[PDB]
Amino acid sequence: GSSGSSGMNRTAMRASQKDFENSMNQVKLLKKDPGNEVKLKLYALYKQATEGPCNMPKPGVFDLINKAKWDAWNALGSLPKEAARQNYVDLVSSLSPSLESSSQVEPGTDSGPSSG
Template identity: 40%
Template sequence: MIEEDLEKKFQEAVEIASFMTQASLPQDVQLRLYAFYKQATFDKSNFTVTDNSDLRNAFKTNAWIQISHLTQAQAKKKYIKLIHSLIK
């Protein structure tokens, strides 16, 4: 997939996701979407570690760590695929 096409499809998937409510998605799906989005859009130059022991943030961080081996392009593709599986 050409990078421009991938970015366009990713932005379209983000737009679709913006209309989904948390109540409509199981928590494991929310965490996967968060992790894929975070990996796809992460700018390592702005990374800061916060001392936030909030359990919700711990789950989000764990979900992200589990997929941190993916490239940004791979994460975008997985995000797009997951969004499209949810709207079917």
């Protein structure tokens, strides 16, 4: 059986587009080299929160570059975008110790169904 170790908590916490746009950025502002291992895990979600489940044709062995990603984005499987984004950020945050989760949004004003 699989389970947490310290304590998997959520508290109705979700990652919005804003959080992502920031996370993906931090992954570029870093001057450290974690390894192609993570560089892929970050791309797997991106394509998952933008395109969805790996629906592309499997690349050829010779194409190590592609094959590397395919296995990254493929792993996800039927992972929904809503979750994909949460996974992407959840990672970038793991690398960086300090992070001000500024989750803000405006209610805006919808329009009513009216025609001339």
